[PDB]
Amino acid sequence: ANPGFLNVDRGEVLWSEPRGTRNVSLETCDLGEGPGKLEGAYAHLPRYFADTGKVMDLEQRLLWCMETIQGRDTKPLVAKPFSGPGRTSDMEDLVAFIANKSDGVKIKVALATPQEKEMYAIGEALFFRRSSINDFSCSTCHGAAGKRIRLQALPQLDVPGKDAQLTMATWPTYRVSQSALRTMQHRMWDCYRQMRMPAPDYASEAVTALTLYLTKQAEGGELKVPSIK
Amino acid sequence: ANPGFLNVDRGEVLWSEPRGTRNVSLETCDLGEGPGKLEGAYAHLPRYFADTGKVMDLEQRLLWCMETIQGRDTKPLVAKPFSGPGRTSDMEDLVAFIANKSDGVKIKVALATPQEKEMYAIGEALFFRRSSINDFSCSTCHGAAGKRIRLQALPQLDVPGKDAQLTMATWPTYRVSQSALRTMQHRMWDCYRQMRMPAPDYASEAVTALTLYLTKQAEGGELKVPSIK
Amino acid sequence: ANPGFLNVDRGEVLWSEPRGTRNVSLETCDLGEGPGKLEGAYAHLPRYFADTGKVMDLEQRLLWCMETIQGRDTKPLVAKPFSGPGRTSDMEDLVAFIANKSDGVKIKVALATPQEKEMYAIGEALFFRRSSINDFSCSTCHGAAGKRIRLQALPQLDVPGKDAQLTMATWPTYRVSQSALRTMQHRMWDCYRQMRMPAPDYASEAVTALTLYLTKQAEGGELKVPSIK
Amino acid sequence: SAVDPARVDAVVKTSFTKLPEGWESRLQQDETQRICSVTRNNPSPEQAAAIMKAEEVRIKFPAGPVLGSWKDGAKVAQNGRGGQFSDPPGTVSGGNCYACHQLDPKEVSYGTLGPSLVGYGRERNFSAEDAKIAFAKVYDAQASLACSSMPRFGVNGVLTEQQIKDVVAYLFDPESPVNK
Amino acid sequence: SAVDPARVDAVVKTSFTKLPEGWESRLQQDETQRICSVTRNNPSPEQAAAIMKAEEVRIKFPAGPVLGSWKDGAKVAQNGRGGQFSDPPGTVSGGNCYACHQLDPKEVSYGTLGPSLVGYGRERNFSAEDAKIAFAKVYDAQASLACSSMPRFGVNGVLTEQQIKDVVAYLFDPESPVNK
Amino acid sequence: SAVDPARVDAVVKTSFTKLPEGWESRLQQDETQRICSVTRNNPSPEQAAAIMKAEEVRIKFPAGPVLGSWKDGAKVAQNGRGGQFSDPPGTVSGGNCYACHQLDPKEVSYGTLGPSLVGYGRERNFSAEDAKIAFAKVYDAQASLACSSMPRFGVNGVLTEQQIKDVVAYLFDPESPVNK
């Protein structure tokens, strides 16, 4: 009854498929819980990785793994990260699969390094940053409780709490009107679009920072993914 | 001439007196400085305890110690925590004894854990919470410098400084007009009474949160307890 | 082309010159990177030092080294810390030489201890503190972007940004109008002077606290020292 | 250091379980209380505007004149009791104006949380228009100053119309000691 | 106090690298956007006074009457398109007034980010002086309320003079459904 | 909220130990100074009201006409000396208005911390009523804007009544360069 499981199943196949110049699968990729360990990984991202010295969200981490473990060139994925009619996205399918291995697990990002603390702070600044021709910031629409834009209820995302827990515990999600499973990368892209901003670069630092800020607000939220909206 | 030392003496006896189904004293209770270690204990409370996963003030910690060490049910003391005519309070007496073991020690609580940081934030919210039929918050009366209500001078408790240091370094105290030694739990009950709020449950999370907030503002205050007011 | 190198040269001689009752040089002074290690030290001050238990800026640490390591009486230095007509300053010279050993290094102060966190908070308080007969605080002139007093452009120092990075990365500096190289100790003295405040004591806690605050706002600034202004 | 405001509500609900008859409501906040709490009584220009507009609508003016009996008003101002869990049933609530304000210049027992109101009526030439403005101020202080710490006596049901009329007369009657 | 790392600017510059012709302007903040961002829409009294003054001088009033066609204003209000990277060239920009405001009392699809504007003209007795104040509001909201969440439609070039005159008519014309 | 540590007062009292006769008063903050520090120049609507009230009572207006000599006012505005530990005894203190404000349109050396004051009198139609308001602004800026960055020249004793009258004529006299 939930078409998002079509993506979960394709991501499972991709996880085990040899690719790249090294001709190996992604089965040894470390997503923060140890090489190859899937359960609970999504619930604990974004986080600092010692091998890159960067804070990384899941999609950034998957790109790095493809490049370094697989020797698979990621220019094609980055060029077309979101699926459309007759064209699936390896990134969306892998995210569906990996996020579902955290289904039932409570969100918990520890700000355990100076790099995570700084990335969190950059996310907070981006959240309140008013720019472009409508003067919008994220906080314009998501900074107060119980508001709506037309008949679309707005979650409050600037404080820890039920709204943030419920938002972040339900991505990735099947979006009915789009007939596609979408990830937090697509949500941020769509948010920026609506603010009359340029499109953010896929798997960019800005998106990671915002993701970390939101995920920290969502701490304790029990993942139920893929969702349907 | 300080009748508060009568409580101190009674609490000294209680500390060492076997009680409860398990028929042992409170001598091995850890108040945060190691089991049995009294000196300095009150100065560093409220604080996070690993063994409960909770931030606890002195009176909550005592109630838990009584439960898990002595097997003495704590429901009778919660129902009647404040002494009155013809009836002493075990809690007031233990708090007087333990607080006095920090006489001369500087107040210092550390927001060392996420739990303490969260508790502080609760305390702060509770302090500014506009409540009940007169709209009062703690900050209505304790939010400004050099003010008074009728001819009662009010300490400013919303920022660190001398007022907050003097206030927290002088509880517990003998309250002349009540002919009784009273603890911070009673002061909070009294304040909430004047705010037209219902009586707070004794050893409640609300009182712990406010206590941590206030104690943080009082950092560096030198305890001189039991006091007289 | 830059008369600040005359100070650098004198500082280098002083660093290696035996002085005081112990009759040894400054070569084993620990400026935070290990005894005698100059490269990068200025870029990482002020900082906490375990041997004194205090957060120290460069000039405070140098005075302490002179006293403890050399047995050199620092009282005449503290009395006359700024050069003038026919009198050079050992402090300006040593600061020139040491800061130049961080030339091209990026400023980074880590608030890695409670002492450092506290001094930073004290600096922030000093920066916003309005007092004296013009009601000035540092934030009056340095709290906004793109302002000027008469035809002197004012850097914004209250938040991290390019202004703060460029200012802190360019002290110590030769001041053309004064025909002297001056250090941050002198700049703070001059700022306070123009706020109609009394002169801060040389090497005082207030100056270290403000320096730590400013240097944190300057994180990432590449030192180009000594500069000319 | 941040917290879920729902957690704070939860903490209140579990910390206050002994409720007198008709007091369960006292743990609720209306939207003005909530906004003033989260902003620590310093709302943004936009929030302040929304508070004053929501509160101004709630003000109920008397049918006729707004001045009552100054002598009865004196009692409202001096009375600091009522509404407390320790108050006996039937206790008349007062305004407790003296808790926060100088009023009668001859009364030495007054607080300083609020401005002095000495000669309030005389300062305004005993204006009936200013009397109506003070009625409004006492009925809902937040209609004219967002997040004022003065209680909203009229709107929260603390003082009756008659009581507020009486305390207005304490401020404005030429024979009130306030105006001598 | 927590403060934004300097790296924020660099993160923006390097995360937004496919830019429609001219859309670099969109990444850079003007001074008012910067103050409102750092104060989280709560500027000091001095900052608020400066923002209102700077914004007021930017307002360009029509040469003649302020009211346009309410029917065309209804279209400005309902239209939430324009200015986005996915919008093809030639897309007409709306004000999306309904996103934030109740307007026609019969229209059930309206947001709550802004105040209800039902009967806006009628409440003000259809005043021409108030119509001009409304024109100013739509042109640059921050001229009158510092750090308002309302977009600066005229000054930012989102709406033309005629569209603003039309939406003011939607608010003020007695025949507008807003006023019926 | 961020809070300033209590230790700040001790740090100040032990860091400024060489004090000119009476200058410990320069370290001591008055109530307005203290509130503007704690709130970082952003007081709550209630606090701002209190500040403005406390400051307005301290303003002492001249007995007769407010306007003095614009020629002498020019000197007040240009002078930035006075009050410093380095100033010799007898140094006349200035208002240093040019440090923050554009005044004479022909003077190129002027700061931008405050608003331009060019044609200040002329745009007010040289109103005697507005001159008195300007007198008050110079005497104590915080009487009309809480936590203003402008020094409270009259109340703090930086400028005499005559010097304030003179600088007011520099703003308001039709023959002042400010108005030409």
Ligand code: HEC
């Ligand atoms: C600034 C870049 C941001 C960010 C980081 C977010 N938003 Fe928005 N948002 C808006 C609307 C109408 C929705 C749909 C709400 C609904 O379906 O009821 C959203 C959704 C989100 C989400 C997902 C929420 C969920 O529960 O699935 C997230 C994570 C999110 N946003 C973040 C509306 C707006 C705006 C209206 C003008 C603005 C501005 C933003 N959003 C900005 C941002």
Ligand code: HEC
């Ligand atoms: C909201 C729950 C609070 C909290 C946490 C506190 N107060 Fe009050 N307070 C008020 C008065 C008249 C006094 C007596 C002062 C004195 O005897 O000197 C107090 C006292 C306190 C204390 C002890 C202060 C001391 O120096 O010992 C504490 C810790 C305290 N309060 C905390 C008056 C009021 C109010 C007037 C309506 C309000 C509201 C509050 N207090 C609220 C709170």
Ligand code: HEC
């Ligand atoms: C409060 C104690 C402070 C502190 C810590 C600082 N300032 Fe000032 N400042 C002012 C002017 C005109 C200058 C010269 C600007 C120029 O021409 O480059 C400065 C300079 C500084 C610096 C050096 C900046 C640089 O880029 O080199 C620093 C580090 C500094 N100040 C700190 C003006 C003022 C004031 C005007 C009335 C006030 C008040 C202050 N400063 C206060 C302080």
Ligand code: HEC
């Ligand atoms: C008991 C019924 C009264 C009455 C008659 C008044 N007050 Fe208050 N008040 C308080 C504060 C902090 C202010 C200033 C902030 C604001 O304007 O809201 C006031 C204000 C007033 C006014 C207006 C004064 C003026 O500026 O013209 C008047 C007429 C007035 N009050 C009357 C604070 C308090 C309290 C603090 C807990 C309490 C109780 C009261 N007020 C009670 C009363």
Ligand code: HEC
């Ligand atoms: C589409 C072009 C419109 C029009 C015609 C108006 N708005 Fe807005 N608005 C918003 C908010 C938060 C406020 C209150 C803060 C402030 O006053 O700036 C307003 C205000 C108004 C008014 C004044 C109402 C009053 O009570 O005096 C008017 C006449 C008005 N608006 C018209 C919020 C928003 C939006 C949020 C993203 C958007 C979009 C709009 N408004 C759009 C419009």
Ligand code: HEC
């Ligand atoms: C030297 C004696 C003067 C005189 C004659 C004036 N100023 Fe200032 N001022 C400053 C700032 C930031 C403001 C705006 C904030 C506020 O209104 O308080 C002002 C304002 C004025 C005005 C009012 C202008 C108006 O809006 O109508 C006037 C008439 C005025 N000032 C005159 C800042 C400063 C300074 C910064 C440290 C200094 C110095 C001065 N002002 C000095 C003077």
